[PDB]
Design a protein around this ligand. Structure first.
Ligand SMILES: *[C@@H]1O[C@H](CO)[C@@H](O[C@@H]2O[C@H](CO)[C@@H](O[C@@H]3O[C@H](CO[C@H]4O[C@H](CO)[C@@H](O)[C@H](O)[C@@H]4O)[C@@H](O)[C@H](O[C@H]4O[C@H](CO)[C@@H](O)[C@H](O)[C@@H]4O[C@H]4O[C@H](CO)[C@@H](O)[C@H](O)[C@@H]4O)[C@@H]3O)[C@H](O)[C@H]2NC(C)=O)[C@H](O)[C@H]1NC(C)=O
Ligand SMILES: *[C@@H]1O[C@H](CO)[C@@H](O[C@@H]2O[C@H](CO)[C@@H](O)[C@H](O)[C@H]2NC(C)=O)[C@H](O)[C@H]1NC(C)=O
Ligand SMILES: *[C@@H]1O[C@H](CO)[C@@H](O[C@@H]2O[C@H](CO)[C@@H](O)[C@H](O)[C@H]2NC(C)=O)[C@H](O)[C@H]1NC(C)=O
Ligand SMILES: *[C@@H]1O[C@H](CO)[C@@H](O)[C@H](O)[C@H]1NC(C)=O
Ligand SMILES: *[C@@H]1O[C@H](CO)[C@@H](O)[C@H](O)[C@H]1NC(C)=O
Ligand SMILES: *[C@@H]1O[C@H](CO)[C@@H](O)[C@H](O)[C@H]1NC(C)=O
Ligand SMILES: [Cu+2]
Ligand SMILES: [Cu+2]
Ligand SMILES: [Cu+2]
Ligand SMILES: [Cu+2]
Length: 564
């Protein structure tokens, strides 16, 4: 079962009984369809990458620099077989943005919900249900491994908040370094974040100097409205994108459909995606799709003009001749003035800051490593052998301190968290793209918009900010900007007993230790993981752990970072 009333003119209707107004967190289309995918990870040394430049190593999903798309319809069940044929590295496949409702075992977080799949052809078949529709991506959680090429896309078909004719498809944008993920982890352990060596466009790159590589083409059909699925799968860079000659109508933020909001330029934090509509009401010519940067505290590239080519049907095979206008500095901040079509509502008029709901982000500049990120006084450092689920599926509640477990006992109530971005640090404060596993959150509010490099600090003040907090259907998504030198307020509803990572999606920072682990409804969760139903999941879990704990001691390399 796919659509039965989903047409160019009526995108809001999907099938009888489901549409763009249907609360997807309650009613899910029962389609008796399952879809299977296979993903095979290989490793390649001394390889020639997208832009002709030698890469000392890369790790590829299905022999390409970018993994395939996991496609399916809202409601279908999904089984994805990850085969790890890497030489030495373990792996954890995470399905970013998936709610994993009551399905923690398949989240894909090593040391948290699973043991890493061993190299040399060890595997696991991840099973899960599409209880959402929209655009996302998947990627390794095994250290910074995805920055080596272990990344890919998701696209579950569903309704839309705005009609359109063509659906171009996913459009992954991802920063590109000639250095390897492990060299960059080692580099940033005592150096600031480097710029990218290039930007990829849906799995392609063109070199600034040698003019090698190639421009990526997107074709437009004069007049017809198109839908573009933009993903930022980077490890660091936050992209400002724009299309010369055209505006872009937002109709989805992350896995959440939203009321049509048109923009001229759009800011993409790491992990964020947006679904824009593009009306091709322009002259049959060629138009730059530009990548630009704001404050360098959230990225830059050695490629000063990365772009792709959007071409009208009938247009020649020339290049765009209009270099476009100047793009405004989005100051390392994603826009919040977006209205979800399915509405939510939390009380905000009652928020009172205290230890039990406040997460303090800090950078310990000490020694070995020089740069270390900590939350609430602790750097997270999971154990690839003994995952939190283990402590849960047994009586042991003696979790290690470095697992930074934040327990939440509230049963299906709203829960408020104020993240503070190192406010007493006079020397530095960086923007962080915060991501929650297992939930979408409402973005209740954040400190006043600032230019990061101006160093303007903001601590939470009840007298100024409570009037600015929004509890009546804010933006809700899985990624949002913690402001530089500021603070962010968030809420999710503990409706999914599990252990959920809450971390920074900058590979360098989360390797540095910038994460906590929400142990949500441990009582309910244990009963779940142990129930008859889960036998096949718990047994697989237990199985992949056995082969990893056995392999581990044969590994020639140590664990250099937190593991995440
Ligand atoms: C980034 O790079 C990737 C490549 O990795 C590229 O992805 C390619 O994306 C496109 C668009 O997302 C994919 O094209 C579509 O495939 C679906 C489903 O395919 C399945 O079914 C067919 C049936 O034989 C099988 O062959 C196939 O193997 C799959 O099982 C189709 O449904 C799509 O066709 C629809 O849209 C087309 C126009 O885009 C129409 O020609 C076609 O008639 C269909 O339109 C219909 O659907 C509408 C509903 O919305 C309906 O209202 C209309 O009336 C009509 O019924 C299309 O073929 C492609 O498979 C991807 N994979 C590749 C090529 O590797 C991205 O495109 C790229 N990103 C950008 C932006 O460049
Ligand atoms: C969008 O990208 C295009 C192509 O990369 C940019 O075109 C360049 O413009 C700069 C201006 O300094 C020139 O130095 C380059 O020679 C141009 N390259 C080409 C191929 O023409 C364009 O500048 C970009 N537009 C925006 C808004 O950033
Ligand atoms: C995962 O694979 C990569 C490639 O082997 C490992 O990175 C190498 O590891 C050593 C020891 O840490 C480094 O000194 C080298 O710089 C790395 N090689 C390159 C070219 O990047 C990494 O250590 C492996 N992780 C595991 C699971 O051991
Ligand atoms: C885009 O078109 C150019 C020339 O028209 C071609 O060289 C290039 O390979 C194309 N890009 C893709 C995605 O193949
Ligand atoms: C894009 O929007 C801006 C203002 O939002 C306006 O200047 C411009 O005319 C618009 N262009 C098109 C083609 O929609
Ligand atoms: C931060 O740590 C303090 C003291 O260890 C603890 O009381 C509090 O619960 C922590 N805050 C959060 C958000 O867990
Ligand atoms: Cu992710
Ligand atoms: Cu995630
Ligand atoms: Cu960070
Ligand atoms: Cu994560």
């Amino acid at each position: 079962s796919g659509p039965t009333c989903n047409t160019p003119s009526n995108r809001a209707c999907w099938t009888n009984g489901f549409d763009i107004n249907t609360d997807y967190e309650v009613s899910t289309p029962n389609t008796g369809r399952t879809v299977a995918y296979q993903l095979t990870l290989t490793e390649k040394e001394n390889w020639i990458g997208p832009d002709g430049v030698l890469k000392n190593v890369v790790m590829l999903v299905n022999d390409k620099i970018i993994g395939p798309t996991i496609r399916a319809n809202w409601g279908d069940n999904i089984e994805v077989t990850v085969i790890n044929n890497l030489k030495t590295n373990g792996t954890s496949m995470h399905w970013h943005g998936l709610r994993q409702l009551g399905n923690v075992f398949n989240d894909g977080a090593n040391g948290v919900t699973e043991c890493p799949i061993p190299p040399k052809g060890g595997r696991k078949t991840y099973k899960f249900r599409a209880t959402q529709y929209g655009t996302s991506w998947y990627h390794s959680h095994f250290s910074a491994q995805y920055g080596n090429g272990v990344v890919g896309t998701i696209q579950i078909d569903g309704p839309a908040s705005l009609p359109y004719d063509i659906d171009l498809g996913v459009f992954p944008l991802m920063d590109y370094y000639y250095r390897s993920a492990d060299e960059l982890v080692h580099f940033t352990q005592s150096n600031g974040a480097p710029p990218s060596d290039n930007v990829l466009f849906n799995g392609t790159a063109r070199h600034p100097e040698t003019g090698a590589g190639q421009w990526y083409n997107v074709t437009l059909t004069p007049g017809k409205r198109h839908r573009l699925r933009i993903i930022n799968t980077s490890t660091d860079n936050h992209f400002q994108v724009s299309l010369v000659g055209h505006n872009m109508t937002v109709i989805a933020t992350d896995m959440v459909p939203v009321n049509a909001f048109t923009v001229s330029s759009l800011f993409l934090a790491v992990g964020q995606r947006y679904d824009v509509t593009i009306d091709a009401n322009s002259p049959v010519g060629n138009y730059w799709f530009n990548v630009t940067f704001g404050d360098g505290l959230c990225g830059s590239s050695n490629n000063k003009f990365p772009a792709a080519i959007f071409r009208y049907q009938g247009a020649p095979a020339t290049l765009p001749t209009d270099q476009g206008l100047p793009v405004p500095n989005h100051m390392c901040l994603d826009n919040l003035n977006l209205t979800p079509v399915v509405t939510r509502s939390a009380p905000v008029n009652n928020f009172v800051k205290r230890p039990s709901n406040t997460l303090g982000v800090t950078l310990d500049i000490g020694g070995t490593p020089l740069f270390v990120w900590k939350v609430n006084g602790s750097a997270i450092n999971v154990d690839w052998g003994k995952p939190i689920l283990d402590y849960v599926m047994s009586g042991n509640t003696s979790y290690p301190v470095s697992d930074n477990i934040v327990q939440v006992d509230a049963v299906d109530q709203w829960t408020y968290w104020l993240i503070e971005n190192d406010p007493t640090n006079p020397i530095v404060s960086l923007p962080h793209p915060m991501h929650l596993h297992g939930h979408d959150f409402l973005v209740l509010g954040r400190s006043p918009d600032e230019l990061p490099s101006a160093g303007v600090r903001h601590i939470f003040d009840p007298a100024k900010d409570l009037p600015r907090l929004k509890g009546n259907n804010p933006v809700r998504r899985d990624v949002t900007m913690l402001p530089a030198g500021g603070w962010l307020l968030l809420a999710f509803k503990t409706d999914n007993p599990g252990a959920w990572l809450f971390h920074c999606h900058i590979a360098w920072h989360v390797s540095g230790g910038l994460s906590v682990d929400f142990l949500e409804r441990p009582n309910d969760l244990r009963t779940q993981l142990n129930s008859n139903a889960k036998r096949a999941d718990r047994d697989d879990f237990n199985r992949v752990c056995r082969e990893w704990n056995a392999y581990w001691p044969t590994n020639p390399f140590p664990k250099i970072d937190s593991g995440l």
